[PDB]
RNA sequence: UCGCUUCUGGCGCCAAGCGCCCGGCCGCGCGCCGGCCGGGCGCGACCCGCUCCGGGGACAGUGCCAGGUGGGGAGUUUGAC
């Protein structure tokens, strides 16, 4: 009777975006960057 | 094309709405059910993946030598009768 949906729109310019996983874009520290690049060189070279 | 917002000196969030399931405390007892109370993949809010996004790039640039220029600067000299 009173219970209603009232949804959101995660467009552009419209309502604020939610919290999703941002693991790929973190500013990782030094000891982590270094080893990952170290492994990649064993595939490039 | 794209996560869809252009007539106006407005508002916009914190866990949203719900949507499917698991659980506890009281009446049912067939308990993973009815009153108070919670978790959950996260459904909504698609998956997978090896460099944060772009721009350059085996040249710039750094080290050591070789040659030219170089009163900006340094040292000095600028006869005797
Ligand atoms: Mg001089
Ligand atoms: Mg002198």
Swiss-Prot record:
Record's subunit section: Component of the large ribosomal subunit. Interacts with CRY1. Interacts with DICER1, AGO2, TARBP2, MOV10 and EIF6; they form a large RNA-induced silencing complex (RISC).
Coiled coil: none
UniProt subcellular location: Cytoplasm
Function text: Component of the large ribosomal subunit. The ribosome is a large ribonucleoprotein complex responsible for the synthesis of proteins in the cell.
Location in chain, cross-link Glycyl lysine isopeptide (Lys-Gly) (interchain with G-Cter in SUMO2): 19
Superkingdom of the organism of origin: Eukaryota
Family: Belongs to the eukaryotic ribosomal protein eL8 family.
Protein name according to UniProt: Large ribosomal subunit protein eL8
N6-acetyllysine modified-residue sites: 5
């Amino acid at each position: 009777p009173l219970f209603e949906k009232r949804p959101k729109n995660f467009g552009i310019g419209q309502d604020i975006q939610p919290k999703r996983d941002l693991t790929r874009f973190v500013k990782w520290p030094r000891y982590i960057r270094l080893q990952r690049q170290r492994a990649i060189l064993y595939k490039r070279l």
